[PDB]
Amino acid sequence: HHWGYGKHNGPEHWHKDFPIAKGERQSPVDIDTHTAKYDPSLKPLSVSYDQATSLRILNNGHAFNVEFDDSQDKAVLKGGPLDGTYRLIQFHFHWGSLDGQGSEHTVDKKKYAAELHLVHWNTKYGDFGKAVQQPDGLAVLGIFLKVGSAKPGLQKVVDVLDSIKTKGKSADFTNFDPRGLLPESLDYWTYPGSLTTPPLLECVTWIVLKEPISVSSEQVLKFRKLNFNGEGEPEELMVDNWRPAQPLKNRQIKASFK
């Protein structure tokens, strides 16, 4: 059936329709700090978001995304473990019903309140569709959110959620600066993985930042007020839209710092 996060169509059922679910490079995984390999040959991250053009915010029934104009090298990511330029196409969050759960990746088994995913695709492939067929087609920057003080740069997103309550609704969302969601440090962990939602394709290089950002209870509280359902259907609150950590198998998590 159309996949979801419920008892009957959740992550433990995805394998029936998406065999790749039991593959060798599935995400997310648990980050074991004592086992991660510090690699000094890794380069520093290069994030150029000064010419970014946000366009729209939409509730797709699984989460809400903020889409950006990716027809040109306007907001890119390079460096780190990547080769080539990757264009930002959208960012979304994964969160929980309670502050002690919500993130997809865990560090030493610890779950954060939420996780931000800035999705980028390798420009050498032409368009997003082609990149999802290549082993190095996508690069997602993952940022953990912990409950604390308000994040000013996130406030514009919070204000507009009201108009995109149910599945299928969208609102114009121009002039948003994604630079306001980055932590101070760009130190990160990296490993080969996959999308965390169906089709679960193994086309991703994961870059998870070491330093989380702080957002207030009221800020995260407004995420929980979104709906999985569409207008007119019975109401299911949008919470716990996250996949459990998958076995590492034979992969190595590397780190840019020591």
Ligand X SMILES: NS(=O)(=O)c1cc(F)cc(F)c1
By annotation, the residues acting in catalysis are: 62
Beta strands in 19-137 (DSSP E): 30-31, 37-38, 45-48, 54-59, 64-68, 76-79, 86-95, 106-107, 114-122
Which partner from the list Hg ion, Zn ion, ligand X, none does 63 bind, CB cut-off 5 to 8 Å by kind? none
- 3-state secondary structure string across 106-152: EECCECCCEEEEEEEEEHHHCCHHHHCCCCCCEEEEEEEEEECCCCH
The answer, yes or no, to whether the previous bond of 28 is cis (omega within 30 of 0) is: yes
Residue 241 within binding range of ligand X, rule CB under 6 A: no
- In the list 113, 140, 143, 208, the residue contacting ligand X (rule: CB under 6 A) is 140
Smallest gap from Cβ 11 to Zn ion, in A, equals 13
In one-letter notation, the amino acid at residue 136 is D
Which partner from the list Zn ion, ligand X, Hg ion, none does 119 bind, CB cut-off 5 to 8 Å by kind? ligand X
CA 202 to chain centre: 15
- Applying CB under 6 A, the span of 192-200, 215-223, 234-242, 246-254 interacting with ligand X comes to 192-200
Longest dimension (CA), the chain: 55
Q: In terms of CB distance, is 20 or 150 closer to Zn ion?
A: 20
Q: In terms of CB distance, is 216 or 240 closer to ligand X?
A: 240
140 by Cβ neighbours in 10 Å (0-12 / 13-18 / 19+) ranks as: buried
Kindly state the tokens that stand for 169.
Answer: 């609704």
Residue 203 within binding range of Hg ion, rule CB under 5 A: yes
Which partner from the list ligand X, Zn ion, Hg ion, none does 243 bind, CB cut-off 5 to 8 Å by kind? none
Which partner from the list ligand X, Zn ion, Hg ion, none does 182 bind, CB cut-off 5 to 8 Å by kind? none
Residue 120 within binding range of Zn ion, rule CB under 5 A: no
- Applying CB under 5 A, the span of 16-24, 41-49, 110-118, 127-135 interacting with Zn ion comes to 110-118
Cα Rg of the chain (Å, integer): 17
Provide the mask over 69-108, with x wherever binding to Zn ion is found by CB under 5 A and - wherever it is not.
----------------------------------------
Q: With CB under 6 A, what is the number of residues at the site for ligand X?
A: 6
Report the candidate in 251, 258, 222, 254 with the shortest Cα–Cα distance to residue 239: 222
The residues that touch Zn ion, with contacts defined as CB under 5 A, are 117
